Design an enzyme around this catalytic site. Structure first.
Site, PDB file in Angstrom:
ATOM      1  N   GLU A 163     -54.338  32.478  20.856  1.00 47.57           N
ATOM      2  CA  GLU A 163     -55.298  31.383  20.987  1.00 47.57           C
ATOM      3  C   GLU A 163     -54.965  30.397  19.877  1.00 47.57           C
ATOM      4  OE1 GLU A 163     -57.716  31.195  23.422  1.00 47.57           O
ATOM      5  OE2 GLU A 163     -56.688  33.006  24.102  1.00 47.57           O
ATOM      6  N   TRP A 204     -51.990  28.416  20.820  1.00 45.42           N
ATOM      7  CA  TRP A 204     -52.341  27.396  21.797  1.00 45.42           C
ATOM      8  C   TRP A 204     -52.941  26.195  21.069  1.00 45.42           C
ATOM      9  CZ3 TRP A 204     -56.079  28.435  26.513  1.00 45.42           C
ATOM     10  CH2 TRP A 204     -55.628  27.676  27.611  1.00 45.42           C
ATOM     11  N   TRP A 264     -60.094   6.513  40.219  1.00 41.51           N
ATOM     12  CA  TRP A 264     -61.347   7.185  39.883  1.00 41.51           C
ATOM     13  C   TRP A 264     -62.500   6.439  40.538  1.00 41.51           C
ATOM     14  CZ3 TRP A 264     -60.407  11.732  38.002  1.00 41.51           C
ATOM     15  CH2 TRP A 264     -59.313  11.948  37.143  1.00 41.51           C
ATOM     16  N   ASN A 285     -65.650  28.618  26.221  1.00 42.95           N
ATOM     17  CA  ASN A 285     -64.444  28.035  26.795  1.00 42.95           C
ATOM     18  C   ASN A 285     -64.360  28.067  28.317  1.00 42.95           C
ATOM     19  OD1 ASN A 285     -61.227  28.794  27.562  1.00 42.95           O
ATOM     20  ND2 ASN A 285     -61.631  26.869  26.488  1.00 42.95           N
ATOM     21  N   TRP A 296     -61.934  11.296  33.597  1.00 38.57           N
ATOM     22  CA  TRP A 296     -62.266  12.342  32.631  1.00 38.57           C
ATOM     23  C   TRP A 296     -62.498  11.872  31.200  1.00 38.57           C
ATOM     24  CZ3 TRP A 296     -58.939  12.491  28.709  1.00 38.57           C
ATOM     25  CH2 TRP A 296     -57.556  12.317  28.919  1.00 38.57           C
ATOM     26  N   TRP A 350     -59.238  18.219  28.460  1.00 44.06           N
ATOM     27  CA  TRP A 350     -59.489  17.308  29.561  1.00 44.06           C
ATOM     28  C   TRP A 350     -58.234  16.879  30.307  1.00 44.06           C
ATOM     29  CZ3 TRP A 350     -64.067  16.502  31.755  1.00 44.06           C
ATOM     30  CH2 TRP A 350     -65.194  16.930  31.036  1.00 44.06           C
TER      31      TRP A 350
HETATM   32  C1  LIG Z   1     -62.598  20.638  28.409  1.00 42.69           C
HETATM   33  C2  LIG Z   1     -62.335  21.397  27.104  1.00 42.69           C
HETATM   34  C3  LIG Z   1     -62.688  20.833  25.877  1.00 42.69           C
HETATM   35  C4  LIG Z   1     -62.400  21.504  24.692  1.00 42.69           C
HETATM   36  N1  LIG Z   1     -62.900  20.965  23.502  1.00 42.69           N
HETATM   37  C5  LIG Z   1     -62.512  21.559  22.290  1.00 42.69           C
HETATM   38  C6  LIG Z   1     -62.985  20.874  21.094  1.00 42.69           C
HETATM   39  O1  LIG Z   1     -63.408  19.724  21.012  1.00 42.69           O
HETATM   40  N2  LIG Z   1     -62.725  21.574  19.912  1.00 42.69           N
HETATM   41  C7  LIG Z   1     -62.223  22.881  19.793  1.00 42.69           C
HETATM   42  O2  LIG Z   1     -61.913  23.353  18.726  1.00 42.69           O
HETATM   43  N3  LIG Z   1     -61.739  23.407  20.985  1.00 42.69           N
HETATM   44  C8  LIG Z   1     -61.901  22.859  22.265  1.00 42.69           C
HETATM   45  N4  LIG Z   1     -61.618  23.540  23.471  1.00 42.69           N
HETATM   46  C9  LIG Z   1     -60.983  24.751  23.388  1.00 42.69           C
HETATM   47  C10 LIG Z   1     -62.019  25.884  23.388  1.00 42.69           C
HETATM   48  O3  LIG Z   1     -62.834  25.890  24.548  1.00 42.69           O
HETATM   49  C11 LIG Z   1     -62.608  26.358  22.046  1.00 42.69           C
HETATM   50  O4  LIG Z   1     -61.707  26.357  20.934  1.00 42.69           O
HETATM   51  C12 LIG Z   1     -63.593  27.547  22.072  1.00 42.69           C
HETATM   52  O5  LIG Z   1     -64.696  27.413  22.975  1.00 42.69           O
HETATM   53  C13 LIG Z   1     -64.044  27.932  20.690  1.00 42.69           C
HETATM   54  O6  LIG Z   1     -64.831  29.114  20.693  1.00 42.69           O
HETATM   55  P1  LIG Z   1     -64.391  30.235  19.671  1.00 42.69           P
HETATM   56  O7  LIG Z   1     -64.263  29.653  18.316  1.00 42.69           O
HETATM   57  O8  LIG Z   1     -65.303  31.384  19.821  1.00 42.69           O
HETATM   58  O9  LIG Z   1     -62.915  30.578  20.250  1.00 42.69           O
HETATM   59  P2  LIG Z   1     -62.032  31.939  20.160  1.00 42.69           P
HETATM   60  O10 LIG Z   1     -61.878  32.454  21.511  1.00 42.69           O
HETATM   61  O11 LIG Z   1     -62.551  32.858  19.111  1.00 42.69           O
HETATM   62  O12 LIG Z   1     -60.607  31.353  19.723  1.00 42.69           O
HETATM   63  C14 LIG Z   1     -60.262  31.224  18.316  1.00 42.69           C
HETATM   64  C15 LIG Z   1     -59.804  29.808  17.940  1.00 42.69           C
HETATM   65  O13 LIG Z   1     -58.683  29.410  18.727  1.00 42.69           O
HETATM   66  C16 LIG Z   1     -58.781  27.993  19.031  1.00 42.69           C
HETATM   67  N5  LIG Z   1     -58.802  27.809  20.511  1.00 42.69           N
HETATM   68  C17 LIG Z   1     -59.152  28.711  21.502  1.00 42.69           C
HETATM   69  N6  LIG Z   1     -58.994  28.246  22.699  1.00 42.69           N
HETATM   70  C18 LIG Z   1     -58.213  27.117  22.515  1.00 42.69           C
HETATM   71  C19 LIG Z   1     -57.735  26.133  23.422  1.00 42.69           C
HETATM   72  N7  LIG Z   1     -58.022  26.216  24.707  1.00 42.69           N
HETATM   73  N8  LIG Z   1     -57.268  24.920  22.919  1.00 42.69           N
HETATM   74  C20 LIG Z   1     -57.252  24.705  21.577  1.00 42.69           C
HETATM   75  N9  LIG Z   1     -57.716  25.555  20.630  1.00 42.69           N
HETATM   76  C21 LIG Z   1     -58.226  26.742  21.184  1.00 42.69           C
HETATM   77  C22 LIG Z   1     -60.074  27.468  18.357  1.00 42.69           C
HETATM   78  O14 LIG Z   1     -59.762  26.945  17.065  1.00 42.69           O
HETATM   79  C23 LIG Z   1     -60.882  28.756  18.235  1.00 42.69           C
HETATM   80  O15 LIG Z   1     -61.943  28.706  17.258  1.00 42.69           O
HETATM   81  C24 LIG Z   1     -61.722  22.774  24.703  1.00 42.69           C
HETATM   82  C25 LIG Z   1     -61.331  23.334  25.956  1.00 42.69           C
HETATM   83  C26 LIG Z   1     -61.638  22.674  27.141  1.00 42.69           C
HETATM   84  C27 LIG Z   1     -61.277  23.325  28.482  1.00 42.69           C
END
Ligand SMILES: Cc1cc2nc3c(=O)[nH]c(=O)nc-3n(C[C@H](O)[C@H](O)[C@H](O)COP(=O)(O)OP(=O)(O)OC[C@H]3O[C@@H](n4cnc5c(N)ncnc54)[C@H](O)[C@@H]3O)c2cc1C
Length: 474
Positions: free
Chosen positions: A282, A285, A313, A348, A366, A389
């Site tokens: 993660e 990513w 759009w 997420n 979007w 997005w």
């Molecule tokens: C439409 C959309 C918008 C998003 N907006 C953001 C946002 O503004 N800020 C944000 O930090 N993340 C964003 N995410 C990614 C993601 O959904 C979150 O990082 C997540 O919900 C954080 O919860 P957690 O800390 O418990 O994640 P965990 O599952 O514990 O993951 C650990 C860390 O990995 C990183 N991470 C995990 N998933 C991703 C991913 N898909 N992309 C980038 N980093 C990721 C984050 O830093 C996160 O804290 C977005 C994803 C989507 C689909």
């Protein structure tokens, strides 16, 4: 004398901080500083939850510096004017800070550095928020990656950096130095209310370096072992909740990687091993999108791919408004939007569902959604948010064949018992999970809950039709 200023921005902690540790190896008279930049604070894209978290991290940082031996200076105004002036008035040997990946931060930084050079003061910009800087991860041809697969393969093989030392025994400024900078300083850290904001929705993890480190440790000590597949269910508290801690740097990226790596080595179970490797990816990513924003800044402007910059759009404002207010009529979507506006965070899996819905079903540019998320997310992060997005339309990096989510399929697959839906839509706790999942709720049993604002099937045919027509017209 010869003090060094360390400028904090998104690294609000004293531990495992690359630029700060480098600064301490050059001088004990290390004075931290934070600048309340009006172009950031007054932006229409600033989330109240983010300011609340930010403000909380700063309160703790003031204490940490006090305990370390010096202090955290607070400034309010334009950085390229105030930072050089402060450094000059303090005859600073240098100003340190960790590099940004965002367009605004990078442009601002180059300007501050130039102003410092003019004043004959050293500016040191080091990489801290990434395990690997954008310049370290390049292809065989020395080019950035726009496809995740090859990026991960390179990134994974790179040796990982370890946490650096916390600076100690700092030397505070003297009264005469304090007199020289008096005009540039705020007497105290403004409260959330004084700044004109209000937030009472809580946080995924309490503000501050201390709370962040405690969460990282609690997560890696247990929950991380079940990350896969508990990460897929919104009803389950299977993720870390560290997102805002990573965005504002309440936690260092190396501490996070190390804690997970140590949990992997300690674990003796295969399933636990896998779950930890998945969490680690993660973080990989996260770097893919951050490096992408760094290498291709135009991504921030909107749809990247040529086809999508032309997509027709529909943009029905009423449909967008309904989306932002959780009045879409699709349970899984409204429950998620409610979680966002109420708590400043969204699981997420739900971010993916609501983003797809807004883009594929409502057919709204979007960018309106990217902005709404930034206006409400406590972890609002350009690289990740824009990455998320662009993903909802394969309009940017790592594109995939056209696809459209069916809220009903997603709901059934990731909230099979509708626990998450009833949790955020308590006025529908009486309805059967079956109906909340399908989205077909009888008028009487729906009460004040609105009916679907769009007919999924028709919206789906409309989107594909517009896609194929533009596809051919090119
Ligand atoms: C439409 C959309 C918008 C998003 N907006 C953001 C946002 O503004 N800020 C944000 O930090 N993340 C964003 N995410 C990614 C993601 O959904 C979150 O990082 C997540 O919900 C954080 O919860 P957690 O800390 O418990 O994640 P965990 O599952 O514990 O993951 C650990 C860390 O990995 C990183 N991470 C995990 N998933 C991703 C991913 N898909 N992309 C980038 N980093 C990721 C984050 O830093 C996160 O804290 C977005 C994803 C989507 C689909």
């Amino acid at each position: 004398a010869a003090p060094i200023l360390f400028w904090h921005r998104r690294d609000l902690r004293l531990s495992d901080n690359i630029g700060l540790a480098a600064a301490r190896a050059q001088s004990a008279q290390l004075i931290g500083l934070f600048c309340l930049d009006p172009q950031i604070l007054q932006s229409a894209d600033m989330a109240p939850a983010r300011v609340a978290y930010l403000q909380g991290c700063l309160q703790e940082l003031q204490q940490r510096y006090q305990q370390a031996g010096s202090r955290l200076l607070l400034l309010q105004g334009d950085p390229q004017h105030l930072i050089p002036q402060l450094a000059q008035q303090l005859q600073a040997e240098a100003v340190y800070w960790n590099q940004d990946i965002e367009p605004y931060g990078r442009d601002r930084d180059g300007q501050v550095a130039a102003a410092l050079k003019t004043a004959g003061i050293r500016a040191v910009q080091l990489w801290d928020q990434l395990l690997h800087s954008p310049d370290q991860i390049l292809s065989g041809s020395g080019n950035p990656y726009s496809v995740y697969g090859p990026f991960w393969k390179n990134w994974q093989a790179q040796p990982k950096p370890t946490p650096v030392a916390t600076p100690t025994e700092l030397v505070d400024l003297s009264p005469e130095q304090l007199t020289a900078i008096a005009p540039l300083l705020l007497s105290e850290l403004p409260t959330l209310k004084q700044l004109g904001f209000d937030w009472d929705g809580g946080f995924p993890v309490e503000p501050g370096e201390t709370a962040a480190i405690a969460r990282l440790q609690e997560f890696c000590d247990r929950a991380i072992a079940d990350y896969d597949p508990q990460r897929n269910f919104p009803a389950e508290a299977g993720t870390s909740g560290l997102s805002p801690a990573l965005k504002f740097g309440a936690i260092g990226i190396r501490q996070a990687w190390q804690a997970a790596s140590a949990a992997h080595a300690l674990s003796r179970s295969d399933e636990a091993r896998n779950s930890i490797r998945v969490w680690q990816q993660e973080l990989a990513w996260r770097e893919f999108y951050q490096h992408a924003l760094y290498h291709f800044p135009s991504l921030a402007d909107g749809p990247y791919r040529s086809l999508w910059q032309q997509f027709p759009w529909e943009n029905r404002e009423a449909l967008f408004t309904a989306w932002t207010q959780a009045q879409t009529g699709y349970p899984i979507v409204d429950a998620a939007m409610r979680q966002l506006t109420e708590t400043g965070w969204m699981h997420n899996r739900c971010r993916m569902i609501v983003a797809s819905f807004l883009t594929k079903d409502l057919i709204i540019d979007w960018r309106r959604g990217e902005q709404f998320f930034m206006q409400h997310l406590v972890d609002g992060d350009l690289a990740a948010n824009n990455g998320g997005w662009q993903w909802s339309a394969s309009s940017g990096m790592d594109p995939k064949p056209l696809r459209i989510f069916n809220p009903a399929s997603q709901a059934k697959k990731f909230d099979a018992t509708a626990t998450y839906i009833k949790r955020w839509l308590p006025e529908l706790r009486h309805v059967h999970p079956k109906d909340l999942i399908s989205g077909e709720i009888t008028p009487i049993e729906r009460r004040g809950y609105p009916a679907p604002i769009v007919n999924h099937n028709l919206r789906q045919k409309q989107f594909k039709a517009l896609y194929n027509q533009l596809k051919a017209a090119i």
